[PDB]
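Homework-ish question, so no full write-ups if that breaks the rules, but can someone show me the predicted structure for this set?
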Amino acid sequence: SSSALPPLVPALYRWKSTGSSGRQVQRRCVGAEAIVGLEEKNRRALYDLYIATSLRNIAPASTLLTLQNLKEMFELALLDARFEHPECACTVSWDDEVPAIITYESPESNESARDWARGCIHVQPTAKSALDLWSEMEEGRAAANDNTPSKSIELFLLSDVSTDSTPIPQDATVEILFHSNHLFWDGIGCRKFVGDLFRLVGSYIGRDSREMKKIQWGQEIKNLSPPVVDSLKLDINTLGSEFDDKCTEYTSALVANYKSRGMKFQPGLALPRCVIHKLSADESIDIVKAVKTRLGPGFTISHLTQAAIVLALLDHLKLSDDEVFISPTSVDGRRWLREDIASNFYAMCQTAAVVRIENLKSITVSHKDEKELQVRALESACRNIKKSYRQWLENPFLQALGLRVHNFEASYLHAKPIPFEGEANPLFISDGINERFIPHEIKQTATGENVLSVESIDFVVNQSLPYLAIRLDSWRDASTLNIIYNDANYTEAEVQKYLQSIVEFMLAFRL
Ligand SMILES: OC[C@H]1O[C@](CO)(O[C@H]2O[C@H](CO)[C@@H](O)[C@H](O)[C@H]2O)[C@@H](O)[C@@H]1O
Ligand SMILES: CC(=O)O[C@@H]1C[C@]2(C)[C@@]3(CO)CCC(C)=C[C@H]3O[C@H]1[C@@]21CO1
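A: Not a homework solution, just the prediction itself:
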C-alpha cells in the first residue's frame, strides 16, 4: 500500500530445497539478476555474454591435438568446473512475478552429468573466427523461432583444419567462443570460470581419465556461491533514512538518464553488433603512464576512458547551457562482501554509482584544438568523474543499494521495456585486467609444458536496446575498447566514428 521504493527482502532470495532428496535447490533472483532475467528479454538473449579467446598451439611437436580430443578434454574439465562452480549448470524459469527463478539440480547420475557436459562443448573445422561464429549465431536466432533462454554456458572450438581428427599444426590457432546467459554470472564470474576451465583442462592433455576417482554428485551444492544479501559485511536491517534517500537519488538519476540528451538513434530492433579497438601494448602503457604523471594516485585509464566518452559525445553534438552529464555506471560489488566470500564469488555481484559532470561547455574541445586544451579538458572531466564515484563508493551500503535499485529497475523495465526515445546517453562499463582471472597459457599440468597460448580475449555482449555501451578491459598490457549497439538503431560507420573519436582523445592524453 505504501508509495516507497520496495525494501530488501533477504529471506526472499535464499537457496531453498524443492524436494525431499535435497538434490534440487532454487532461489528468486535479485538486483541486476532481475534486469537480465526479464523473461521476454532473456528468452531473446539480450545481454548474453560471449567471450572470444583466440589461442595458438605452442605445444611440443610431440603433443597431438585435434578438435575431437580437445572436445573430449574440455568435457572432462567442464565436469570438474561444475563440481567447483555449479553456476555453470543452473537453469532459469519464471512464474507470474518479474524476477526470474534460478534453479540448481545435482546430476541424477554420473552418466547424466557426462551427457550434460558433452552437450555444452562443440567443435567445427572452419576458418571462421570466434566472433564470426557469434555473428552467425545472432543472425540465425531471429529466423529460428525459439525463445529458449541460453544455457548458463556452452563452448565452441574452431580451427582451420579439414576434419575433427586432423592434427592441429604447431603455431596454428584454435578459437574458443564461450557463450553464457548473463543471468548466472557477471563479467567477473564468467571470466573467472573461463580461467578455471583453462586450468582444469591442463589435467587432461596427454592422457586414462575413465579410471580417475568418480565425482560424488550432490557434494557440489555447497559450492554454489551463497546468496549475495547474506554475504554482505553490512547488516541490511540496520539501514534507515540515509539509505532510502541515496536509493532515491539513484532511481531519480536512472529516470533522468533515460530521458536525457545523448546520441540520436533510429527506432527499431534488429541485430546485436560490436566494434572493437585493440590499443597496442605500447599505446596502452603510455596512456597508463600519462594518467599516473598528470593525475596521479587513485586515477586510472578507466576514468580517462569515461572522460573521452564525454568529450567525444560533446564533440559529436553541434545542449542546454545547464545540462549535466549524468550516467549510472556499474561497479563490481565484491568489495562489499565478507573477505572469505569476496574473492570466490561467481554469481552476479554488481552495484552502481552515478557519474556527474557539470560545466560541459568548459570541457568542450575539438580534436583540432591545441593539445594542452584537450589535456586540460580531459583532466577536468577525470576529476569530476573520480569525485562522483567517491560519493557512491565510499558508502558501506553501496552493494545493498545496488540490489534494491536494480530490483526497482527490473520492474521499471518490465513496464517500459525500451526506456529511451529519440536519443540515448552512452553507457560505460569498466572490467579491468583479464590477467586477474584468465591464465596466459593452458599448460599440461603433469609437466608444466605450455600447450596453448591465450593470445586474445574479447568480451562481447548482445545489445538489443538502443544505447551505446562501451566496455574497457586489458590483456597482455594492451587495453581493448569495444562498443555494443543494435544495428536498427545505429550504423557501423557511425559507431566506428564515435569509437575512433574516444580513442583519439585518450591518445591525446599521452605525455
Ligand atoms: O596503429 C596503432 C593503433 O591502430 C590500430 C592498429 O592495429 O588500429 C585498429 O583500429 C580499428 C578500430 O576501428 C580496428 O578495428 C583495426 O582492426 C585496428 O587496425 C590499433 O590496434 C592500435 O591502437
Ligand atoms: C548502470 C548499471 O548498473 O547497469 C546495469 C549493470 C549490468 C550488469 C550491465 C553492465 O554489465 C549489463 C551489461 C550492459 C550492456 C549494461 C549494464 O546494464 C545493467 C546490468 C544488467 O544489469
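Now go work out the reasoning yourself. Hint: Residues 62 and 206 are 10 Å apart (CA to CA).
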